[PDB]
Amino acid sequence: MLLKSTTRHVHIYAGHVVDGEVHPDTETLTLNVDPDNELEWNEAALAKVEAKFRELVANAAGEDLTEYNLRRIGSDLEHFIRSLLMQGEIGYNLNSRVRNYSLGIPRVNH
Amino acid sequence: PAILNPIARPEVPQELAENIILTSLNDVYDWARLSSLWPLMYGTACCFIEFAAMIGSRFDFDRFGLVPRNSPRQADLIITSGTITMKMAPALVRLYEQMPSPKYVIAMGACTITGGMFSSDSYSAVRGVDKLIPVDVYLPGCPPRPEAIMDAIVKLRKKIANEHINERGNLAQTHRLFTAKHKMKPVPPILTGQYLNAPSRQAPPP
Amino acid sequence: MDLATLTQTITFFALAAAVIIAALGVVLLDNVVYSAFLLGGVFLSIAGLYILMNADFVSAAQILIYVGAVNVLILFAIMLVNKRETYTPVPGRWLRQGGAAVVSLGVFALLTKMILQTPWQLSSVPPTPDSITTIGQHFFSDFLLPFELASVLLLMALIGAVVLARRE
Amino acid sequence: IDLQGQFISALQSLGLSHDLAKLLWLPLPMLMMLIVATVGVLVAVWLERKISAAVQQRIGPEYIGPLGILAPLADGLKLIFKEDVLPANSDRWLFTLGPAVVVIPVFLSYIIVPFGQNLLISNLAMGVFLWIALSSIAPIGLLMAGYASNNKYSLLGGLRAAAQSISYEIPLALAVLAVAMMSNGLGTVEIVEQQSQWNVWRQPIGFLVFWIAALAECERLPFDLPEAEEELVAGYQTEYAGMKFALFYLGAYVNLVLSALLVSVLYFGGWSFPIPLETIANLLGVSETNPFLQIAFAVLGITMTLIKAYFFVFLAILLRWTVPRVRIDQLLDLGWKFLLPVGLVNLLLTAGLKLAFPVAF
Amino acid sequence: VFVLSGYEYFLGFLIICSLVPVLALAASALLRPKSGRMIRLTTYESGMEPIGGAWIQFNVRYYMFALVFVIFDVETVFLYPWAVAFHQLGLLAFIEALIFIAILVVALVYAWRK
Amino acid sequence: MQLTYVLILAALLFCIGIYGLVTSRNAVRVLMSIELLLNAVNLNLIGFANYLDGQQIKGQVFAVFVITVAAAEAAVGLAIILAIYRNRDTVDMEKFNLLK
Amino acid sequence: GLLAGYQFVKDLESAGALALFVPPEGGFEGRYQRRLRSKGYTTLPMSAPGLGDLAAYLTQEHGIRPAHTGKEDIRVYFQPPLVTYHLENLPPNAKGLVLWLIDGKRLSKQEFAYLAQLTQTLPKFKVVVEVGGDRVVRWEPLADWVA
Numbered sequence A: 001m002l003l004k005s006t007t008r009h010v011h012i013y014a015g016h017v018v019d020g021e022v023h024p025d026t027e028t029l030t031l032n033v034d035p036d037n038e039l040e041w042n043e044a045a046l047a048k049v050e051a052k053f054r055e056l057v058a059n060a061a062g063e064d065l066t067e068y069n070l071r072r073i074g075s076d077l078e079h080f081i082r083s084l085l086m087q088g089e090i091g092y093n094l095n096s097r098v099r100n101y102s103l104g105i106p107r108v109n110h
Numbered sequence B: 001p002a003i004l005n006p007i008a009r010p011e012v013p014q015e016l017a018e019n020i021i022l023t024s025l026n027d028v029y030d031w032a033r034l035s036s037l038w039p040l041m042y043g044t045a046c047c048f049i050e051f052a053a054m055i056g057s058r059f060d061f062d063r064f065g066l067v068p069r070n071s072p073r074q075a076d077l078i079i080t081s082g083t084i085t086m087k088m089a090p091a092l093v094r095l096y097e098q099m100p101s102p103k104y105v106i107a108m109g110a111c112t113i114t115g116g117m118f119s120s121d122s123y124s125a126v127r128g129v130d131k132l133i134p135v136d137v138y139l140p141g142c143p144p145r146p147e148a149i150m151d152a153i154v155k156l157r158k159k160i161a162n163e164h165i166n167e168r169g170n171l172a173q174t175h176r177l178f179t180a181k182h183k184m185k186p187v188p189p190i191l192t193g194q195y196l197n198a199p200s201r202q203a204p205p206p
Numbered sequence C: 001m002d003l004a005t006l007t008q009t010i011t012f013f014a015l016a017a018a019v020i021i022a023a024l025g026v027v028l029l030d031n032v033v034y035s036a037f038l039l040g041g042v043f044l045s046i047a048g049l050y051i052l053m054n055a056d057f058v059s060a061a062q063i064l065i066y067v068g069a070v071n072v073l074i075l076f077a078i079m080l081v082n083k084r085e086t087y088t089p090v091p092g093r094w095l096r097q098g099g100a101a102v103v104s105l106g107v108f109a110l111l112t113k114m115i116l117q118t119p120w121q122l123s124s125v126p127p128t129p130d131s132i133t134t135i136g137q138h139f140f141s142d143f144l145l146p147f148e149l150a151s152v153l154l155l156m157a158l159i160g161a162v163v164l165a166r167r168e
Numbered sequence D: 001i002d003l004q005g006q007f008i009s010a011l012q013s014l015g016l017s018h019d020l021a022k023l024l025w026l027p028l029p030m031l032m033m034l035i036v037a038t039v040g041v042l043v044a045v046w047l048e049r050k051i052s053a054a055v056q057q058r059i060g061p062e063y064i065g066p067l068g069i070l071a072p073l074a075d076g077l078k079l080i081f082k083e084d085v086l087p088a089n090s091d092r093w094l095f096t097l098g099p100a101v102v103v104i105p106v107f108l109s110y111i112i113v114p115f116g117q118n119l120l121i122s123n124l125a126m127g128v129f130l131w132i133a134l135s136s137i138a139p140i141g142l143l144m145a146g147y148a149s150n151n152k153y154s155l156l157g158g159l160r161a162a163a164q165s166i167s168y169e170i171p172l173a174l175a176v177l178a179v180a181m182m183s184n185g186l187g188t189v190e191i192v193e194q195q196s197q198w199n200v201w202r203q204p205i206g207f208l209v210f211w212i213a214a215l216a217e218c219e220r221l222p223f224d225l226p227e228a229e230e231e232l233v234a235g236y237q238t239e240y241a242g243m244k245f246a247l248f249y250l251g252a253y254v255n256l257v258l259s260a261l262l263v264s265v266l267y268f269g270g271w272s273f274p275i276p277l278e279t280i281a282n283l284l285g286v287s288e289t290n291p292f293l294q295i296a297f298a299v300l301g302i303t304m305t306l307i308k309a310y311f312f313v314f315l316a317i318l319l320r321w322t323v324p325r326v327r328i329d330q331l332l333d334l335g336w337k338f339l340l341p342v343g344l345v346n347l348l349l350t351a352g353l354k355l356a357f358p359v360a361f
Numbered sequence E: 001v002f003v004l005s006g007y008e009y010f011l012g013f014l015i016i017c018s019l020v021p022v023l024a025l026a027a028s029a030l031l032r033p034k035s036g037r038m039i040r041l042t043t044y045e046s047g048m049e050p051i052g053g054a055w056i057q058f059n060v061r062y063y064m065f066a067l068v069f070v071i072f073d074v075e076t077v078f079l080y081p082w083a084v085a086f087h088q089l090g091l092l093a094f095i096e097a098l099i100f101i102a103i104l105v106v107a108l109v110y111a112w113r114k
Numbered sequence F: 001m002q003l004t005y006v007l008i009l010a011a012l013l014f015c016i017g018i019y020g021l022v023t024s025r026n027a028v029r030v031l032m033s034i035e036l037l038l039n040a041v042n043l044n045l046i047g048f049a050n051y052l053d054g055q056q057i058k059g060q061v062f063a064v065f066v067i068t069v070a071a072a073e074a075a076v077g078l079a080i081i082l083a084i085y086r087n088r089d090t091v092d093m094e095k096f097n098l099l100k
Numbered sequence G: 001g002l003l004a005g006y007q008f009v010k011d012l013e014s015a016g017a018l019a020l021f022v023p024p025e026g027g028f029e030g031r032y033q034r035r036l037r038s039k040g041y042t043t044l045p046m047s048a049p050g051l052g053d054l055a056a057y058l059t060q061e062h063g064i065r066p067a068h069t070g071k072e073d074i075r076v077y078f079q080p081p082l083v084t085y086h087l088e089n090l091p092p093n094a095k096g097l098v099l100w101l102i103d104g105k106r107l108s109k110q111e112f113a114y115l116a117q118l119t120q121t122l123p124k125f126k127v128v129v130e131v132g133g134d135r136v137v138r139w140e141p142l143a144d145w146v147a
Ligand SMILES: CCCCCCCCCCCCCCCCCC(=O)OC[C@H](CO[C@@H]1O[C@H](CO[C@H]2O[C@H](CO)[C@H](O)[C@H](O)[C@H]2O)[C@H](O)[C@H](O)[C@H]1O)OC(=O)CCCCCCCCCCCCCCCCC
Pocket: D001, D002, D003, D035, D036, D038, D039, D040, D116, D117, D118, D119, D271, D272, D277, D278, D287, D293, D294, D295, D297, D298, D299, D301, D302
């Protein structure tokens, strides 16, 4: 069975997406940043997120594969995404979708 | 750092349509869809009961066409009623993603829009479902009067009637997916059958 | 040379093509459930072929029994025996496969020669439309022994099958 | 009038190969019956939703149309536009075929629904027996919907559905058998023309058996086991999303209007405003070629068929909210332990009464 | 030769009825959202994940209930032409059909006693 | 649509059923092939009844009996297969050989 | 008359501030918003009962104070003007930006007059306010309906 940490704009699984399926593997740790397109992404920001994901899964892991640790990785990835959005590297989508600012409203940095 | 949490500022402006025939057909596409919402029979806690009161004879959502459905495959509306703990958050996202694409969400009660009375000193409640799924309508209040759930249904119908068949592009999932090998010692699942046939149930240890 | 006969020929050849393709699928396909459903396809096509031969009662009877009772039985039993099909190939296979193929082709050629050679007695008189009342007359005048012994046949089949498929 | 005569004659007046005109007319009734079947489905959905609401001191759909008239239209058009899902390891071709095999033979059985004499598609010689044979293909559809799923939830539902649809096929045939004993035949028009001055009054047990067996075709809340939400989620339907699920949602109400019309024609008669109407020689009407009287009696026959079909649709969707469900084993004991013995007893009784008193049988 | 009157309609109506699903299900395919591939494509297990293994614990519960159905399905086929032709037959056919039905009744009793 | 065509079709169905009865390895498929064979026989009977003996149809009653008994023999054969499966736990017809 | 043309958009471009009278079932005015959006105008509905002065929220800035709940002592956010910030983020070929207010019944006549006057200044900015009412979707200029 799968082991996953699924929240908004982060989806970590424990398998390999071959064509759309998941296929639990016990060492792949796929990642699916922002499926619903709450935000608008760039090529540099996605690379930063992938690098953070790698250094978070590789440099700090010798522990079990419980769903607790998967959630613990997803939480750090989402804090990193929120920091990227605060600094302004990315932004909300503004498209005609739901548009509920889940990571905070736009403020003016006083 | 000029404006924190900025907006997109997009390009390629709209590519929307104008001819009377296609907008008149969009009228029917959106009328058939909003006046036959089928909610998923999904309750977790207190608010569900008020939702059930909204099913009862005192005032039923049967008018304006709402028939509660059991499986998410036929449901196109999930009225999240109850506090979502961290134990059950992935059990909701699943039920949401396991459900056809022109779908909607209503976060009812305070415990699904901000965390509610559990937004403080609680270590297990998800502080709002807006950080799990794209909510469409929020109605506040510990258990909201079941004629406030119907007000939320009114505000959701007038949002559904807004959609545009020439705009269903903002409805798929982009799937920016990656991969990274790990070394993390898979453990055996500690949740199986074996409750009464367990050997430790039949005789005390010496 | 007509619109009725043209339809009766086109439908016959369509149903014959359906019979051949579904019957080849029953025996050639690697998956067994596809064969279990193409079998009902065969039975439905043959039920149509009966109607095209002025036999309206026996076609409905076939649809009742073959694609309504025997097919459902075969589907249940095919579900009962699922174990993921770990069939290891056996050496002495091309021998029996080739033998079956050649004996089948030879028997078919022999039967086709026999059918195209013998002078059947066509007896050009239009058949009867009320084909069920006649079958009702033959159950109790001519075919009384078989009609009466089919009951005991069904009873012994029920007894023996319950005994074999019982659980104890 | 004989609209067929006029159509073929006016079409042959401009040539067009008279024999070919008879081929150019089949679509006319073959789609008139489709129209009445679809309207019957809309009526059945509307009646269910508006009668279940009255029974429960409630109000059904009222914000769709004037009286919720457009509620079935909306519920269908929604399911048209819905994204269809096909789960991971499920089969791809038995999936999209189950909901069609459970529907095609339910529509095909409308060949034999009379709606008044000369007002039906090709009164067949097999008639009701052809319907008994065709109603045995839906279990293949349910087994197909269950076998082509990676969900063991729904295979167990497909099996318990295909095992209920075969339990109520022997008594459903033993009731039509007793009706065909009296009817001298099997064609529906020939079955009903024995009512010339109703079979319910001479088959008071076969009527009960037929009606119970027809309600127990995986249709009504008396049973509705594969749809019993609480015990199991939708059974086999739990994985169909768009139009594939609407085919189940639709093939279950057409299978109800069909049964209502069939109980009407077997035990009551799609004719016969109760008095022996055709003995209205008291108005000195030459029915034979009366240009009207023909249309007046046509309308009377259609109304008298629909009254007694609506009676049973009403009574079925009323029992839905009156009779408690039975598990699955109290269900399989109705057939094979109560309905099959009583069906055999009714058949033997009709035989004994037809051999002794050949009049009135 | 073909003398079965009423047929012409069963073929045409069979075609027009088989055309209803393959047309509604194609109209729905033309106008409906595209794919939803990633995790929409899993099996519904009440929100949790499939337990694994995924068998059925085979039971003869539904072979016997199909055996006994086949038996009486054949019985009805044998009884239909007797009932339709009960006029020209009269007596001495009721006796044979009654023997048939009694044998089938003993069959049902045997199936119901185990 | 002639008698020779119906007979050749029945012979070809007989052929296919024989091939499936000898070649197939699963155990229910041989029963399905036997059913194909019995259908090939019923087709002969109905063709002969429709063309040769068309008034007092006697191939059609014989065909009714053939259908009856094919149902019965299937009901018994699936029972035999369930019995052998309950013990050997397979249906591979190339493993029911207790000989040399 | 069961199907509408584009008179709504013309009337909005003429008056500037309309006052809908939608029926209290809320599924028959979204099509008029879709008509607005198809012309080039971009909408944004923000449920009037919940805005402040309507001048600090729409024109000027305003310090939003989130819900500290015992932790995280009082902090302000200063979200930008809800209009001047959305007039800058219009799509390239955008005809304007109309402001939709769902529950307009809660506002007062003073705020209605303010919203009407705000349309003349600040050019690319129209206003629709769903004041509750009639059983058909009728509109009326927002400069009217008051005084
Ligand atoms: C969604 C569900 C509802 C949707 C509606 C269906 C869509 C169609 C909409 C069109 C409606 C307009 C048609 C006007 C109805 C009058 C036509 C008629 O009666 O025509 C009747 C003729 C009669 O046919 C002839 O009828 C003759 C005599 O009548 C016979 O009819 C029966 C057979 O014996 C009776 O037993 C009777 O005694 C017998 O004499 C002979 O049988 C001939 O062989 C036969 O050809 O058939 C025909 O062309 C009829 C063929 C067309 C069928 C349409 C009928 C629709 C039902 C309308 C009922 C109206 C009720 C009252 C309306 C006002 C309100 C109070």
